[PDB]
């Protein structure tokens, strides 16, 4: 049933606020928490993401965290800013200046128990807690450093719950800080060990989609976050509406994760639209199917055709022929059979949900566990290694009492992750 | 004399709904249990107020499906205490259903079953409905079957098991769950009727012209077939009149206890004025692979047993002639150690269909139950998918994390390999 949502750091709260805006509209909830829609499908599983106070007013089960105090104000002044539980804002005075060590050890640790108190409270008022979802960037200090600390503390305290993250990966094309590969590698190390499912949201991919496909010569964070919100809506559809397939976090995980460390998903969706123009036409089912598998529609900067799919979940939204969906999904699987691992029979599951996302009559969301995601980690690794070999800015981390061996531990783990993807990429049934 | 039906997990519960729906229609019982104005009292108890109540338990580890039963058309038919739910399901994981989550509710289920058993003056045993594929249908069922074997050792246990199909599958690990539950249930089950969701799916598309079958389509057809099979228990008759007799007639050799069901005719409700089929025609249709509940080819195998269960306007001499015809038109090879005599039961009541189902009324229908070595093809298909994944240990950590030893995979798989050789040895050619 219940999911507790945590958003950490600037990026975490920005895409986090966007997520809540988007699913609130889908569910008919206005910024005061009142339901105002005309479908019973909207409310049937509202309890997954919303607490229901009297009455009848709905409050996001969301905890909002940052070491930077200013982040409070921007969230609150946002459209749905007043809907969050005032007591669930947990913030610091300074914040980490892109220092993962500050986030985790120093400054996060100072904050963290406050956050956990709020988490604990949201949890005890749950009928049957499913688990947690975290939105954060990997490239900064708070979302990354403190976020992974939170995850490790939550793992200790709720060891049998599913831990899910929406983690946005740094790219030189979007942010001008060369320590971001440090922060991301230290984080990837934590996620490999402590999350069950991680959606890899690549700022590299988001920027390229905006620049090259959507033709936005100067993409803003707002441009990027429009892609993220559409994706987050899509990948949580099965959790938020009645249905048969992947209806909860654990069932999704058992279907998507054949090996515990390989739980980094590549999300995609169709159609890709620039915010505020225009429309349509609505896609056909074939058009949807083909675009949602297209490398250009992925939120991770990897070419899926460079690797193989271990598992895939595909979600079709809107009114459409279930039979035409079945035919097209069968089509893409056997025309491209060499791209789907042969030793996991029937590894593509398809869901249909009848309520389309805003602005659309038909849309498709793709969730892939593909060996091609090793390209993302190889990219981070190469930048990490370039910096770490010259030991640049290392004292900024060790100055917070961090062991230098942690850098080497994280690097090795990530390179091990890459080797593992390659191993199963070359594996054969024979 | 009494039989208790137990429905486990989403599939078992939803098929159960369809079955009891049809049973009420067949015995003239309303959704509140009243009967306007003896045989069916094996499946229904009776209160002092004239209320007929199913001898049935519905169990799920999660409440969604059973909450529909509790609030639906038959909200007043069942004992409310025999509708039992946890809050957290088995997540498509046999080990959760068997070892973790299932252990949380197993004692309540057994105590509630005990309450039904205490109302019986001569309990025959249990009919158990579940999927192979879900964590609950697979894991909890085998836990329940183990415990029922300790608590009712003399009783018969029959299964209706839903064999997975890709068209309606919801988990990659369903081959794992299927082989794990078969391994641990084999010893405790006396007779098990597999229902291949792909066979049912195909029949719906081909004979009922349903473009994209839903569980509601599949289940009404499945329940029509289950009713043909259990009718002998609920009416006067001379064939399969109690659970013991099922094993006697269909299971000569205790590990090979998986009969193939074949049913005819299946005719679209849109074809209400179809010319009626003869006894000869429906009997012949029983040896067409297209009408089987499990996809396999019986001409590739040998028969160990064969029962024909007719319903409706069926003259015995016509059955004998129809049987004589097939025994000399058709290649039906029996094994050399059993009577090649088809056993025949006839129920003269016209078959019942649910209004607003997809089936047309017919004047005569037949369910054939045969034990054929051909059904080993179904096992081989599951075993192969099992082997592909297990070679890589794909998904195995999910099970080991939930109270299960890794060794149990290979043990279950070897048992399956043994089951397949049992079929090969019996089908001596």
């Amino acid at each position: 049933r219940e999911i507790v949502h945590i958003q950490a750091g600037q990026c975490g709260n920005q895409i986090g606020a966007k997520f809540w805006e988007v699913i609130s509209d889908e569910h008919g909830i206005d910024p005061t928490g009142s339901y105002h829609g005309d479908s019973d499908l909207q409310l049937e599983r509202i309890n997954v993401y919303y607490n229901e106070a009297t009455g009848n007013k709905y409050v996001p089960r969301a905890i909002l965290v940052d070491l930077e105090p200013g982040t409070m104000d921007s969230v609150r002044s946002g459209p749905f800013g007043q809907i969050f539980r005032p007591d669930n804002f947990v913030f610091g005075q300074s914040g980490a200046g892109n220092n993962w060590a500050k986030g985790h050890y120093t400054e996060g640790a100072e904050l963290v128990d406050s956050v956990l108190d709020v988490v604990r409270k949201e949890s005890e008022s749950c009928d049957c807690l499913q688990g947690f979802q975290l939105t954060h960037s990997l490239g900064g200090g708070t979302g990354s450093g403190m976020g992974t600390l939170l995850i490790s503390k939550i793992r200790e305290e709720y060891p049998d719950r599913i831990m899910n993250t929406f983690s946005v990966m740094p790219s030189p094309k979007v942010s001008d800080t060369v320590v971001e590969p440090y922060n991301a590698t230290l984080s990837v190390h934590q996620l490999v060990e402590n999350t069950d499912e991680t959606y890899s949201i690549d700022n590299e991919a988001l920027y390229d989609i905006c620049f090259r496909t959507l033709k936005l010569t100067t993409p803003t964070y707002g441009d990027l976050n429009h892609l993220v919100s559409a994706t987050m809506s899509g990948v949580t559809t099965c959790l938020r509406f009645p249905g048969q397939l992947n209806a909860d976090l654990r069932k999704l995980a058992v279907n998507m994760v054949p090996f515990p460390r390989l739980h980094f998903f590549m999300p995609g969706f169709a159609p890709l639209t620039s915010r505020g123009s225009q429309q349509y036409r609505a896609l056909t089912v074939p058009e949807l199917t083909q675009q949602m598998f297209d490398s250009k529609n992925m939120m991770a900067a990897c070419d899926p055709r460079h690797g193989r799919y271990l598992t895939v979940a595909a979600i079709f939204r809107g009114r459409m022929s279930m039979k035409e969906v079945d035919e097209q999904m069968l089509n893409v699987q056997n025309k491209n059979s060499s791209y789907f691992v042969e030793w996991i029979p029937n590894n593509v599951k398809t869901a249909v949900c009848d309520i389309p996302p805003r602005g659309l009559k038909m849309s498709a969301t793709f969730i892939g566990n593909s060996t091609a995601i090793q390209e993302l980690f190889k990219r981070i690794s190469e930048q990490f290694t370039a910096m770490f070999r010259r030991k640049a800015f290392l004292h900024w981390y060790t100055g917070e009492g961090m062991d230098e061996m942690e850098f080497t531990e994280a690097e090795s783990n990530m390179n091990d992750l890459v080797s593992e993807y390659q191993q199963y990429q070359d594996a054969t049934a024979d | 004399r009494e039989c208790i039906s137990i429905h486990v997990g989403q599939a078992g519960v939803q098929i159960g709904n369809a079955c009891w729906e049809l049973y009420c229609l067949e015995h003239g019982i309303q959704p509140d249990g009243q009967m306007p104005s003896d045989s069916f009292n094996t499946f229904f108890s009776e209160t002092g107020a004239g209320k007929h109540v199913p001898r049935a338990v519905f169990v799920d580890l999660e409440p969604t499906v059973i909450d529909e039963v509790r609030t639906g058309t038959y909200r007043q038919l069942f004992h409310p205490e025999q509708l039992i739910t946890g809050k957290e399901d088995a997540a498509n994981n046999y080990a959760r259903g068997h070892y973790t989550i299932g252990k949380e509710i197993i004692d309540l289920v057994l105590d509630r079953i005990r309450k039904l058993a205490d109302q019986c003056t001569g309990l025959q045993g249990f009919l158990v409905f579940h999927s192979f594929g879900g964590g609950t249908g697979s894991g909890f069922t085998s836990l329940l079957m183990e415990r029922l074997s300790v608590d009712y050792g003399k009783k018969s246990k029959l299964e209706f098991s839903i064999y997975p199909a890709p068209q309606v599958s919801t988990a990659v690990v369903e081959p794992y769950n299927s082989i794990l539950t078969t391994h641990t249930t084999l010893e405790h089950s006396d007779c098990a009727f597999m229902v291949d969701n792909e066979a049912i799916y195909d029949i719906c598309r081909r004979n009922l012209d349903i473009e994209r079958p839903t569980y509601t389509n599949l289940n009404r057809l499945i329940s029509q077939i289950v009713s043909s099979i259990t009718a002998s228990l609920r009416f006067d008759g001379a064939l399969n009149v109690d659970l013991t007799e099922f094993q006697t007639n269909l299971v000569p050799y205790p590990r090979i206890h998986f009969p193939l069901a074949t049913y005819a005719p299946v005719i679209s409700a849109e074809k209400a004025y179809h010319e009626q089929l003869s006894v000869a025609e429906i009997t012949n249709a029983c040896f067409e692979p297209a009408n089987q509940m499990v996809k396999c080819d019986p001409r590739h195998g040998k028969y160990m047993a064969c029962c024909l269960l007719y319903r409706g306007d069926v003259v015995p001499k016509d059955v004998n002639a129809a049987i004589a015809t097939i025994k000399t038109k058709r290649s039906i090879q029996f094994v050399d150690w059993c009577p090649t005599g088809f056993k025949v039961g006839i129920n003269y009541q016209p078959p019942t269909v649910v209004p607003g189902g997809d089936l047309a009324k017919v004047q005569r229908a037949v369910c054939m139950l045969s034990n054929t070595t051909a059904i080993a093809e179904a096992w081989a298909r599951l075993d192969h998918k099992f082997d592909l994944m297990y070679a890589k240990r794909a998904f195995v950590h999910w099970y080991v994390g939930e109270g299960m030893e890794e060794g149990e995979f290979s043990e279950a798989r070897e048992d399956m390999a043994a089951l397949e050789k049992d079929y090969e040895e019996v089908g001596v050619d």
């Binding site: 050890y105 490790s152 060891p159 190390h189 934590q190 490999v192 060990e193 402590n194 515990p260 460390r261 009492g401 961090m402 062991d403 061996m405 942690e406 531990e409 090795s412 783990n413 091990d416 | 950590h397 999910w398 080991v400 994390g401």
Partner: peptide, 15 residues
Amino acid sequence: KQPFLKRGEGLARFT
């Protein structure tokens, strides 16, 4: 100096 997460620590969750 601060103790840190080791490789493989999360593999215990499934045994």
